[PDB]
RNA sequence: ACGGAGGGGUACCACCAGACGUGGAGUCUGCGGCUCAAUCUGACCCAACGCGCGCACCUCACCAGGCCCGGACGCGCGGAG
């Protein structure tokens, strides 16, 4: 599951993408958790995240495209259908947060 | 319609009887010309010329130079590595 609330989040946002955003959201930000891209371009790219997280709230899952799905980071035509390639993301972080059903 | 045709009428944007003026000097203002990078334009008998309701900026159109897109909305492509 996990595919509807993000959308409810996104209308008020809370998810973020790109390396600069996450780190600035990793430090000095209310990082609840984030579903990573799962060691894509580089593990060390994300080992910077895991090391800091375990040194300083999240987990991992293999579903990057979905990360671009719940994220409004794909061109969605008015018909509510897929158009462009679901833009892979990785920064994952969640802020406002406003899951429990999963745990 | 016109008549250096005829007959009736009329009005100080016609005259008689008079008055006050203008055109003469300096100046305010608008108008053609000359000039300039530009001296933004319209209107030319009555029926254009202190008229288009006060130009240091704006007004502002013209002259010499510089920021901005404030390119709505649909199709293809790319885009958060």
Please report, for residues A19, A46, A102, the alpha-carbon distance to residue A62 in angstroms, rounded to integers and kept in the order given. Answer: 18, 13, 16
The neighbouring-strand residues paired with A94 are A15
For chain A, what is the total number of helices (H) and then of strands (E)?
Answer: 4, 0
Q: A87 beta carbon < 7 A from strand B?
A: yes
Query: CB within 8 A of A86, min separation 6: which ones?
Result: A65, A66, A68, A69, A73, A74
Give me A16's structure tokens.
Answer: 């973020």
The burial of A51, by beta-carbon neighbours within 10 Å (0-12 exposed, 13-18 middle, 19 or more buried), is given as exposed
Token pair listed for A67: 């990360």
Cα A13 to Cα A55: distance, rounded to the nearest angstrom: 27
Å between CA of A101 and C1' of B13: 100
Checking each nucleotide's C1' against the CA of A17, the nearest proves to be: B80
Declared resolution, Å: 3.1
**What distance in Å separates the CA atoms of residue A5 and residue A25, rounded to the nearest whole number?**
20
Two structure tokens written together for A103: 């745990």
Contacts of A4 (CB under 8 A, 6+ apart): none
Structure tokens at A91: 């920064």
Beta-carbon contacts of A60 under 8 Å, excluding residues fewer than 6 positions away, are A35, A36, A38, A39, A50
H runs (alpha helix) in A13-63: 19-26, 43-55
């Amino acid at each position: 599951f996990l595919k509807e609330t993000f959308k409810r989040i996104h209308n008020m946002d809370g998810l973020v993408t790109g390396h600069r955003q996450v780190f600035k959201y990793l430090e000095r930000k209310r990082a609840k958790i984030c579903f990573l891209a799962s060691d894509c371009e580089e593990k060390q790219y994300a080992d910077i995240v895991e090391c800091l997280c375990k040194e300083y709230h999240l987990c991992k899952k293999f579903t990057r495209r979905t990360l671009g799905e719940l994220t409004g980071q794909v061109r969605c035509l008015a018909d509510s259908d897929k158009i462009i390639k679901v833009v892979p993301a990785s920064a994952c972080v969640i802020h406002n947060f406003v899951d429990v059903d999963s745990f």
